[PDB]
C-alpha cells in the first residue's frame, strides 16, 4: 500500500477488520467510528456508528461513501442519510446495504464532514469491505478436497506466498483467523496436522468462485507458505494478499 507512517492515516485500523466484523475502525478526539457487519451470499449489511465524544452537539454531520473506479462497478452500496445533528455524548447510526457484483481489490472510502464549535471537521477512512466477506464455507471430506485441488489447470489460478510471520504463530488464534476469514476450516485433510486447510465459495452477482487454500507454518523460521487455488486468477491473488497480511 501507500508509503509512510500509517498512524493518523485513512487506514490505521483497516487490517483488523478482515477476519472479524465488529469493532472500532477510527477514533480521534471528537469522534469514534465503530462497525458491526453481517454477510450472506453476495450481500452484506454494515452498521456504522458515529459516537460524539464531546459535550457539544455536531452540526451538518455528513458521512458519504465513495467507491473509486473499478470499485464503482464491482461493488454497489446503498444507504440512508443520517441525522445531521449529533448531540454531545450521543451516537448516530448508518446502515449500509452491500451488493458484490464481481471480485474486487479496492476498498470504499468513508468521508465524514461536520461542524464542531464553528469549525470544519473532515475525516476520511478506508471502509473494511473485503472480498473474503462473501465466503460460503464449504465442508467436505479429504478425498473430495483433493479431487477438487487437482482439478486446477490454469497456472494463473494458483497463487503462492512464502512470507515472514508478522504476529506470534499461535495455533488457536490461527484457527480463529481462518474461520473469521470465511472459508470452512478443514483439519483431517493435510496429512501434516500442524498445517491448515480451507475451502469455500466466494459469492458475487456475476460469478461464483470455488476456493481452496493451504497454510503451512514453519515455527522455527517464523514463516508461512500459503497456497491459494481458485476458479479465478484475480480471486486467488486478492485472497492470498488479504490472508497473508493477517499472519
Amino acid at each position: 500500500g501507500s508509503p509512510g507512517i500509517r498512524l493518523g492515516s485513512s487506514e490505521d485500523n483497516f487490517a483488523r477488520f478482515v477476519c472479524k466484523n465488529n469493532g472500532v475502525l477510527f477514533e480521534n478526539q471528537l469522534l469514534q467510528i465503530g462497525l458491526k457487519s453481517e454477510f450472506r451470499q453476495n450481500l452484506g449489511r454494515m452498521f456504522i456508528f458515529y459516537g460524539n465524544k464531546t459535550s457539544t452537539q455536531f452540526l451538518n454531520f455528513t458521512p458519504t461513501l465513495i467507491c473509486a473506479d473499478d470499485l464503482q462497478t464491482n461493488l454497489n452500496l446503498q444507504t440512508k442519510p443520517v441525522d445531521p445533528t449529533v448531540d454531545g455524548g450521543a451516537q448516530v447510526q448508518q446502515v449500509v446495504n452491500i451488493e458484490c457484483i464481481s471480485d474486487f481489490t479496492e476498498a470504499p472510502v468513508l468521508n465524514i464532514q461536520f461542524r464542531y464549535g464553528g469549525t470544519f471537521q473532515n475525516v476520511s477512512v478506508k471502509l473494511p469491505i473485503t472480498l473474503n466477506k462473501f465466503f460460503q464455507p464449504t465442508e467436505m471430506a479429504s478425498q473430495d478436497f483433493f479431487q477438487r485441488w487437482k482439478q486446477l489447470s490454469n497456472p494463473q489460478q494458483e497463487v503462492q506466498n512464502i512470507f515472514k510471520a508478522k504476529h506470534p504463530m499461535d495455533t488457536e488464534i490461527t484457527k480463529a483467523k481462518i474461520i473469521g476469514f470465511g472459508s470452512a476450516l478443514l483439519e483431517e485433510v493435510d496429512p501434516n496436522p500442524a498445517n491448515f486447510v480451507g475451502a469455500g465459495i466466494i459469492h458475487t452477482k456475476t460469478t461464483q468462485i470455488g476456493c481452496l487454500l493451504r497454510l503451512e507454518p514453519n515455527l522455527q523460521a517464523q514463516m508461512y507458505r500459503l497456497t491459494l487455488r481458485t476458479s479465478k486468477d484475480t480471486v486467488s491473488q486478492r485472497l492470498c494478499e488479504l490472508l497473508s497480511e493477517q499472519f
Binding site: 483433493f146 493435510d190 496429512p191 493451504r214
Partner: peptide, 5 residues
C-alpha cells in the same frame, strides 16, 4: 504418499 503433488 504425499497427496499434495
Amino acid at each position: 504418499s504425499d497427496p499434495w503433488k
